[PDB]
Paper text:
Transcarbamylases are the enzymes that carry out this work, by carbamylating an amine using as donor the carbamyl group of CP. Similarly, agmatine, the decarboxylated analogue of arginine, can be used as a fermentative source of ATP utilizing putrescine transcarbamylase (PTC) in this process. The subunit body presents the classical transcarbamylase fold, consisting of two domains of similar size and gross fold, the N-domain (PTC residues 1–130 and 301–315), and the C-domain (residues 131–296), corresponding respectively to the polar and equatorial domains of ATC and to the CP and ornithine domains of OTC. Each subunit has a characteristic shape consisting of a hemispheric subunit body and a projecting tail formed by a C-terminal helix (helix 13) that is a characteristic and exclusive PTC feature.
We prove here by in silico studies and by helix deletion and experimental investigations (including X-ray crystallography of the truncated enzyme) that this C-terminal helix plays paramount roles in trimer stabilization and in the prevention of formation of supratrimeric oligomers similar to those seen with some OTCs. The same approach was used for phasing of the crystal (diffracting at 1.6 Å resolution) of PTC lacking the C-terminal helix and bound to PALO. We confirmed the decreased stability of the trimer of PTC lacking the C-terminal helix by deleting this helix. The protein with this deletion (generated by introducing a stop codon at position 318) was purified normally from E. coli and gave nearly normal enzyme activity (619±42 U/mg, compared with 670±68 U/mg for wild-type PTC). Nevertheless, a significant although small fraction of truncated PTC was eluted as monomers from a size exclusion chromatography column. The size exclusion chromatography studies also revealed the elution of the majority of the truncated enzyme at a volume expected for hexamers, whereas wild-type PTC was eluted as trimers. Helix 1, the helix that is buried in PTC by helix 13, is centrally involved in the intertrimeric contacts that lead to the hexamer or dodecamers in these supratrimeric OTCs (details). We confirmed the involvement of helix 1 in the formation of the hexamers of PTC lacking helix 13 by crystallizing this truncated enzyme. The crystal structure at 1.6 Å resolution confirmed hexamer formation mediated by intertrimeric contacts involving helix 1 (rightmost panel and detail below it, and S2). Since these contacts are abolished in wild-type PTC by the presence of helix 13, a function of this helix appears to be to prevent the formation of supratrimeric architectures.
Author numbering:
A (entry chain A), B (entry chain A), C (entry chain A), D (entry chain A), E (entry chain A), F (entry chain A): 0 to 76, 78 to 317
Write the structure that this text describes.
Amino acid sequence: SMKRDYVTTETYTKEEMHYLVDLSLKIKEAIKNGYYPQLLKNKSLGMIFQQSSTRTRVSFETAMEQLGGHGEYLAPGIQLGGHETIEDTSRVLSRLVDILMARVERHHSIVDLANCATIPVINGMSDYNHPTQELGDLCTMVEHLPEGKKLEDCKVVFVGDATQVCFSLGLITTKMGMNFVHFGPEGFQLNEEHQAKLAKNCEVSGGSFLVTDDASSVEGADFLYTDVWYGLYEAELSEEERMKVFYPKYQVNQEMMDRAGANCKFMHCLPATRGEEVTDEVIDGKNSICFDEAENRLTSIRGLLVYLMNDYEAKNP
Amino acid sequence: SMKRDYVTTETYTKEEMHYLVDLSLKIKEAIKNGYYPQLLKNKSLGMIFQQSSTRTRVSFETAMEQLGGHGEYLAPGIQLGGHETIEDTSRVLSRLVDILMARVERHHSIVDLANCATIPVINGMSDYNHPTQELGDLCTMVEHLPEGKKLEDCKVVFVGDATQVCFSLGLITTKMGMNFVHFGPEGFQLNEEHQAKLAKNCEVSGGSFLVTDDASSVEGADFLYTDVWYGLYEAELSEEERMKVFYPKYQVNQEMMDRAGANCKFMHCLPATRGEEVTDEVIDGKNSICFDEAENRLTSIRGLLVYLMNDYEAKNP
Amino acid sequence: SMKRDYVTTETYTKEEMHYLVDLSLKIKEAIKNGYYPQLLKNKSLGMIFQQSSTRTRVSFETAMEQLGGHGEYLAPGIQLGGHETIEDTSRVLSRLVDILMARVERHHSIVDLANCATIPVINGMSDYNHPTQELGDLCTMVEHLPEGKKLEDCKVVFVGDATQVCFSLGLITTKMGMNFVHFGPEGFQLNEEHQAKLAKNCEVSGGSFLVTDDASSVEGADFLYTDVWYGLYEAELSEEERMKVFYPKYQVNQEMMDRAGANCKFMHCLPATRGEEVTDEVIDGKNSICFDEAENRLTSIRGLLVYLMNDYEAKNP
Amino acid sequence: SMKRDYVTTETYTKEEMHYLVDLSLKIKEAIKNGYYPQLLKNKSLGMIFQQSSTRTRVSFETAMEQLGGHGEYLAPGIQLGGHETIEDTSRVLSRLVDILMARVERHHSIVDLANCATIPVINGMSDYNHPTQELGDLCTMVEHLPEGKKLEDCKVVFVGDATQVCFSLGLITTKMGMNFVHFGPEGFQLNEEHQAKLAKNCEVSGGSFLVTDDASSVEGADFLYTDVWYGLYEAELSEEERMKVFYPKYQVNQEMMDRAGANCKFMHCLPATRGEEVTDEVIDGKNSICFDEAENRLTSIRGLLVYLMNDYEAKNP
Amino acid sequence: SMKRDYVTTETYTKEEMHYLVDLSLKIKEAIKNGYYPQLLKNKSLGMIFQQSSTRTRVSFETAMEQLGGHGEYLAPGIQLGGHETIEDTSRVLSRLVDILMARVERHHSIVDLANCATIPVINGMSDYNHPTQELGDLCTMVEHLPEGKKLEDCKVVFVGDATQVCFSLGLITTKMGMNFVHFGPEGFQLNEEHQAKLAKNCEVSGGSFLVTDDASSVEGADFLYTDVWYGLYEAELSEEERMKVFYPKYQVNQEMMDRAGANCKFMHCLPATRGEEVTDEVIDGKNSICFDEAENRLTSIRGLLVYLMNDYEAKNP
Amino acid sequence: SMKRDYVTTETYTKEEMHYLVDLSLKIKEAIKNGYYPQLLKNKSLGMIFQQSSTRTRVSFETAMEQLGGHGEYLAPGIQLGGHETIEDTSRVLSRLVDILMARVERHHSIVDLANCATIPVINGMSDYNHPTQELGDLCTMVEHLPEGKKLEDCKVVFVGDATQVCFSLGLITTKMGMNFVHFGPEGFQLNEEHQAKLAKNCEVSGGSFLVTDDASSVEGADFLYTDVWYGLYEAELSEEERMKVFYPKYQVNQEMMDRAGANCKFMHCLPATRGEEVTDEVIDGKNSICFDEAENRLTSIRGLLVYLMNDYEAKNP
Ligand SMILES: N[C@@H](CCCNC(=O)CP(=O)(O)O)C(=O)O
Ligand SMILES: N[C@@H](CCCNC(=O)CP(=O)(O)O)C(=O)O
Ligand SMILES: N[C@@H](CCCNC(=O)CP(=O)(O)O)C(=O)O
Ligand SMILES: N[C@@H](CCCNC(=O)CP(=O)(O)O)C(=O)O
Ligand SMILES: N[C@@H](CCCNC(=O)CP(=O)(O)O)C(=O)O
Ligand SMILES: N[C@@H](CCCNC(=O)CP(=O)(O)O)C(=O)O
Ligand code: NI
Ligand code: NI
């Protein structure tokens, strides 16, 4: 083709993900030392958000500035579909910016945008997956690799609801050959189709996956990860409804961390509902890496933007 | 004076419009070859939008980045008029940005902004005209000039409603000495005052204009252009109402294109209502140049911004 | 510490404020001569607005571009507090931008943001004070210093309501050793706590302050300053209610200016309600400096941003 | 291969030379309008001079600065050949600069440098030819094209000694399909091998060439070109010796220009020996373009450097 | 005209020299604070040296880099005059660099270069004067202004030979309205024509000048300045010859400084012959400012280059 | 202190040398990928050469351009010492450039320059040592580390004369904990004082050193290094004299390489005298890394310049 998209890590090999991590960490280190590599000079990113965002939006906008380009915030309601067709919007934006991202209510919207645009398209989260979160989370696990452990020998346990972030964490950990668990209650577990995709990743990678409601599954976790309980932006569970499903068994508290292990690190994509999926004590505690993880939303987005723009330039000399 | 505005092409000569085209195409060619001329370094554009926009807004914001400056999106509701007077807003913005554009509900708002501001002001569309569309459309017609034809010998036919874009296309084609037709139904034709202005342009240019409901008027068109049927943002015609006025006589379909001529190119400012003013077959067909035309919204805005900033610097050494 | 904030000028000495003025005016002069000092290259400012703004918002966004960085407009409703705690938002933004500003409904919000963020935080106005307005106003008074007068011998009279801008003007004038008066009606005067803070400033500076409803207080003013009468954004006084309190005694009209003195300059933070706190004749008259003052919102913000980023870099080598 | 050299225009087609002219003139026009295209950013040119130079050396050094790179002056005596072999010098410099030029006493030296270096090598003049002079001279003739004439219908007459510049002018004019004459005395005419190469160029181009001692050959010249009479830097003819050969028949004086034609333009590569090959009256006269021609040494070198670096980057992605 | 030269300060007013000082010191302060104003971006300076130089040459070359341009070192022997006429060299260089300087054996050479070039020409020292030294020395005296003294009330005494630097110091001090003395032995004093020029400066400035062999003339000097005794580069006095003329009466030693005054500062253009015109004790002593003075060769050259390029751009829009 | 010099690696620890290698290789990799880190923006390097140079001079000049600064070539004969004292030259240059290097005839000259200058001074080779060669050579050995070997287990054998490069190679290899041999004839071996310094390095590093005329010493070398036989620039041995001392025993030929080992790499600082210290077959052969080594003169100089400028900025905030 003449471009590459980042809609799902399912289209990336382990080697490509490692390259993305390595590129991201090199850029991070330069900036830490006071030097900003101008790798996207005069390039323009269209940023389409159908939902609210702090970390994803600010990461894209900051990343562009840091690398010498600019991000344009197209707020909820440039509509995807509607009166103007997605084919028209996609072809028009392909002439007016160099690269696109979109956070979408429905996954088909990002797929359609990628299919119809002739410039790189990045999924900034859908109801299905969250691939920039995957890369940031991988950067974070690499930086916080336990002493004497290979990445592939790490155990990553996601606690709670089968969110798009849960699935995405499963996708990236299995892609990298790691050991993944979704610890969640029946009715809120990764589904058969999700699990088939995790198995497919493991066939190649030698990693493992388990989906279970067994509380002992947290034992030996190197990373213990959670997310909110209220579901999707269009149809939230109420406090009473979600507490009924998840509390207290799926609350990440100090007792759960102690059971997972003394050096187990706590992760959360954020925003967090303190007192539901995680207690103040854990998220603010010595083993929380969620703020390093949030920083790495920017770390990973810088590397990804550069990778995709380099690919585009290679295909369009 | 100490600045120049771009409110209407009525204040520009043919020679100035050619200069704007030539400048725009030089910048376009540089960028096509991977080089971004930093002609607006550290300059700031205030972008006031009273209505939704994809092409105009993204073109301004991208243009500024590409040329080394920045565009600020001032969303619907910095009010023009209201509690704070237009004189105050204009004088204040003149101290805080280098150049302004505004897409306005009512033409007097852009006129007032231009009259009261001491920096260049650009009309990003009003209920009266659409002069940046004119320049982009002219760039497009120049690029797609038929073999063996001079620009002045081209025939440009606008089909349908007497929109501000219809009038603007009349203004630019007549300014350049071309042959213009508005093919539209009685009651929805360019009015007496519009036509007097077209005649005035032709007195100088030697071009021609005709406003007619004769379907044979499309015959021999080099460019066949249309726009939506629903009218102005504040007071849309319903689907039933606009179909009653315009359908099927004013639908640009393959039969109309065949009648216009085999090499006639289709143009539309966009967004398009597929199945009303144009069929899928035409807009997606081999003779459609509307996506090149959309790209040239950015092409023309880059040249215009540079022209106006150069003029400002010449007057304010 | 590892950063410095700009929440109130109460934490700045006279010498520091002079340094800020001098830095701001040097940058202004360079730009006047066509040279843009790239003092914030690749730096990112998060701009959180809980209320509407023309001058503050555009000043921050333009300042960043002029100095080689970028400002991100985070529109009303990234919430401060709410579902996601202020501690979380603050720590997250500290990883994703280099510097923050916020215009807040309630002062505690900016205090909390500053306390929880590890990057510099700037108050873009609260219900308590308006410190960037202070610096811009000081730059303006320095530029318009009366012939043969020291800054400290100037008399600055604020007319009307005890707005946050009124208090801020009191804070800066007393900090610089000048003579301040709030001329306002009983019930709408700077309160006991405000006045205690002004007295504290004067203990150090040798300046003076008076809060009074005596109309003779305007006599001998070098600067006569006013603001709107309708109160705070969340709870406005109606036209009838505010006219009943303030009109005509507190209307700045030509007669009041004549009484203050022939060379007294008129100031207003803007937006102004013409016909209430000021007449057209005064604000558009020969002794009005409110548009120079508005320009100096940008002048002062450039200097402040550079000062705070330099401080940050000094503390984080 | 992995690079391209500019040792002789014999390896360039007419289309490539036109491209070089067009690129050079676009860059010239940008700079005339105050804009410097940064097309060689951070690139380093090694400049090896075995002989003195004003125009060639300054053109290369200025060109690099203008385009965002740098030229290094390697003065007579980094030796080519000698104790360190040319193979070693060439391979070493290929690691330490991006592009090379050399003005050489003997043509084999530039050939050897080009053959052994893996970066582009440019001939800055040898005893055989002078290809950057060719391109500058072509740019000059294009700019000064007579009214109503095609380039190919122009007549270019070189007067005097069969210098490397004489031969080079023959090479470029015949490559472009023009009509060339060397008007020179027997014993000092382009030799049989030179003429065979001119005939070979004309076989492709349809141009013409003549080598003659007939004074009537100047009649109808559009460009009349000359050079010094003293021969090569290592073995100059004395004043008496060269006057005996060339004077007065080959002196370009006003009478010769009048005979050539009223609009014939005078060219000289410079430095000129006033009173020998040209009189003060001609070189300082209204029809002299030698200073425009000297400027175009820089014009052409900018275009060439960019062309060769672009070619290198295309071959080494 | 279309440019301005800097051949002698005789063509500059006191106000222009103050502007040059002020500009130079602003640039110096920026660089001291770590910021390099890019005021000469992509501009090229030709640097012609007929004599050796450390301070002048390095100052020009460094200044260009610091301000975003480049200086080209044209070493002794691009000849001025000779085989190629000065008119030709001047016109050719005017096409190939933006600005020129030259250090020349004979003053007429710099005059001829300035007269024939259409770009700014700067005198880098001749046998007559040294105007960049003047500006650097003035910057130095301003920075080291004695407490409680105006510039005009300062006494500047040059000791020793009537060098071009001696005369230049007389020219600048008298231009600025200061009090100048040349303390030198009969036969080696500023001549009648020099003194007539100093008187002419004083007619305008109200300054004073004296040329004398009275040793009491050093008393009350604020600045005591000297230079070498060996004369001009082409015809040096031997050690014995110059000692016979000048030693010990004109040796600046600690006794002379004590007599001049406790706060008198020692200046020397450098290079110095330690043990002749100055002792180690003085030049390395607490009251020596010659290294600050040497730094200000660069300070002044930066300001001058910018001033002349700005003037050129103003005249050639 | 307020700066750091690079006169000898004797003042650097193993950890510092590793840091220098790592920094150099990061910069090299960026440039290989088409990105030039602007780490020395607007910085000026004075380059003083008392002897001829290709690799050192071009490396410094190119390095400065690549990193956004500039190098000034001060050719043989700004004299160090002489009429103007070294103290004066050093103090003057400290005001006029940011960093200095010098290639000197006598080591005391670089020591004096470093001691008297207040800016970083780099030794570009003396009669004693060659520390930039050390760093380039170390970068080269790291890049060409044999499979399955640690740097410290490598054997490096220098063949021939006890040149400054021989000693320097001993210094760096022993500093890094490697195993060094000088294989050279009696009378031309590293002397007692050299060897005492190598022993001192080994006391810390655990490396080894041997100085011997035993031809079996080459056996097991991982790197086999040589240099010219003619001695120092001021007093060369003739061909007959040096052949008498060194030939054929110390000629690096294919037989010697075969004896050293099949994967032993050949190194030479260059220029090489082919047919003396090395045969064509070896230097042009598959195991020669001398051109990679020459490239790494630039690799190492980039890292060193950045390291020293960063150190300077840290000490002079
Ligand atoms: N399951 C959650 C996932 C939120 C991911 N968070 C982020 O990407 C951080 P942001 O929203 O601040 O960009 C949901 O559906 O809302
Ligand atoms: N008659 C139409 C004109 C739309 C012009 N379109 C554009 O300028 C493209 P945009 O809206 O995406 O900027 C109307 O009044 O709506
Ligand atoms: N008392 C007024 C203060 C307005 C200050 N104005 C500004 O800062 C100018 P802006 O709102 O355009 O940024 C109020 O509470 O509204
Ligand atoms: N036949 C002459 C050619 C000189 C060409 N001149 C130039 O290239 C101008 P320059 O020497 O100033 O670079 C000779 O052999 O000397
Ligand atoms: N009278 C002395 C003047 C030297 C001025 N010195 C300088 O300009 C310093 P520089 O030579 O290092 O540039 C002479 O004729 O030599
Ligand atoms: N022993 C040799 C060392 C030469 C080192 N070579 C280099 O540094 C390469 P260069 O001279 O090209 O910079 C001698 O004394 O000459
Ligand atoms: Ni922006
Ligand atoms: Ni240079």
